Write a protein that binds this DNA or RNA. Structure first.
Ligand SMILES: Nc1nc2c(ncn2[C@H]2C[C@H](O)[C@@H](COP(=O)(O)NP(=O)(O)OP(=O)(O)O)O2)c(=O)[nH]1
Ligand SMILES: [Mg+2]
Ligand SMILES: [Mg+2]
Length: 430
DNA sequence: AGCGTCAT
DNA sequence: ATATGACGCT
């Protein structure tokens, strides 16, 4: 109808770095560039656990969450770089810093929401209308979109990938209505021109390549980004949604990869996101509750209102280490020594944070997991964080958990601890 | 406040 | 065989 909202009011992009930790190591070590390559943590455990994989190594089937020794069976020439270890744990300082390089450049173009160490959303609505003016009324050249895919195109009456790409892009452009400054597709198109520039800026100034999605909301931008990785960007228009969603498994939409998505599948008897359109909102609200119901009713139509939040910094600063199986911490002396390792790294990072971003954390959260409980957090207690001091912070963290020790013995800890997690939260401006 | 979900 | 971050529910 004429009163029904189509969710075309915003231009939103998600930019995600291609195999980010590997790129960071490849920039540093030229010997690793353009090779099957992976980043692991903890060498002595089956060669280390893989957390990032180059696309050359992906083509042998190497994946995240693989042990390196297993990965070598698939890929014997697989090169590896290992994560820095400090105080007996993984230290991610180099990637956090690399992330700041990327985030800052993105910030010159628009207000961003940092979504992970590697990706950010971008509300390009204002930048689009500003460019749209000063473009007078000139058409948009395909030269301006040299890595952009139009989802759903080409269609209708080349055998190579770049061949298909341009044909899709030509079809799209040749249909475009530059007469109308207020057309959503035009908005998206100009949004995509800006992301080309932004992505060019990131690579020119950091050496890092990335992919992006351009659409009208965060969920479509995120999904779009993944459609043509690596080193490419994808425009998912409102019109492209019904065909796209008609074979799109539900688990692929953001926040639907867990238990909620499974229950949508199980309770409703469906597989694809598009199948959700045949249910009334009240029906959906009835099954998955009021909030999820509303969200699903609109999302299966390509409509989502979640705003890009202005927030380039993390809201919490955290430290954890798992103590699996037999390395579980079973003495009081062990627990105190590790809380101190954690407290020391956290102090280092909080002091940095205070000087960089003019703020202080005020609350400390202590998380632990106990042997046998598969709940990845068994218990969570908190205290005041009044000083950036490792010894006090570990002493406090111990105070608030020490009563979990069921061991009648003075010097023993039971049940043995399989995770320690320290988290600084509740920031105030300093 | 403490716990559960989803995710990179 | 084996590290963090955002946010929702009660
Ligand atoms: N320590 C740790 N780091 C992780 C884990 N999972 C991901 N990371 C880190 C390592 C990742 O590099 C980084 C970004 O996560 P993605 O974007 O989902 N994977 P990438 O960027 O490598 O490839 P592409 O995006 O092109 O598919 O987060 C984990 O379980 N543990
Ligand atoms: Mg990435
Ligand atoms: Mg990412």
């Amino acid at each position: 109808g004429p009163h029904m909202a189509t969710g075309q009011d915003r231009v939103v992009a998600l930019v995600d770095m291609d195999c980010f930790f590997v790129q960071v190591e490849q920039r540093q070590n030229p010997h690793l560039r353009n090779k099957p390559c992976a980043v692991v943590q903890y060498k002595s455990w089956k060669g280390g656990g893989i957390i990032a994989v180059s696309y050359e190594a992906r083509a042998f089937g190497v994946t995240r969450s693989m042990w390196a020794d297993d990965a070598k069976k698939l890929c014997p020439d697989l090169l590896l770089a290992q994560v820095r270890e400090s105080r007996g744990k993984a230290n991610l300082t180099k990637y956090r810093e690399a992330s700041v390089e990327v985030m800052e450049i993105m910030s010159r173009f628009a207000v961003i929401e940092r979504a992970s160490i590697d990706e950010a959303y971008v509300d390009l609505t204002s930048a689009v209308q500003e460019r749209l003016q000063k473009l007078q009324g000139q058409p948009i050249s395909a030269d301006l979109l040299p890595s952009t895919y139009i989802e759903g195109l080409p269609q209708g009456p080349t055998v190579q990938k770049e061949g298909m790409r341009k044909q899709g892009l030509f079809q799209w452009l040749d249909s475009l209505q530059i007469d109308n400054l207020t057309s959503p597709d035009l908005q998206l198109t100009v949004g995509a021109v800006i992301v080309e520039e932004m992505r060019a800026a990131i690579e020119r100034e950091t050496g890092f390549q990335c992919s992006a999605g351009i659409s009208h909301n965060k969920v479509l931008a995120k999904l779009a980004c993944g459609l043509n990785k690596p080193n490419r960007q994808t425009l998912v228009s409102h019109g492209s949604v019904p065909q796209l969603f008609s074979q799109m498994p539900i688990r692929k939409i953001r926040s639907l990869g867990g238990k909620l998505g499974a229950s949508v599948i199980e309770i409703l008897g469906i597989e694809y996101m598009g199948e959700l359109t045949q249910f009334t909102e009240s029906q959906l609200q009835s099954h998955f509750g009021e909030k999820n119901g509303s969200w699903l009713y609109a999302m299966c139509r390509g409509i989502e209102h979640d705003p890009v939040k202005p927030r380039q910094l993390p809201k919490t600063i955290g430290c954890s280490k798992n103590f699996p199986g037999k390395t579980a911490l079973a003495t009081r002396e062990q627990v105190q020594w590790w809380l101190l390792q954690l407290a020391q790294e956290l102090e280092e990072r909080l002091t940095k944070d205070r000087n960089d971003n003019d703020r202080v954390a005020t609350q400390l959260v202590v998380s632990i997991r106990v042997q046998g409980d598969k709940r990845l957090s068994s218990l969570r207690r908190c205290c005041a964080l009044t000083r950036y001091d490792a010894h006090k912070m570990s002493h406090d963290a111990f105070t608030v958990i020490k009563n979990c020790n069921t061991s009648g013995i003075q010097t023993e800890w039971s049940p043995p601890l399989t995770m320690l997690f320290l988290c600084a939260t509740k920031f105030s401006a300093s």
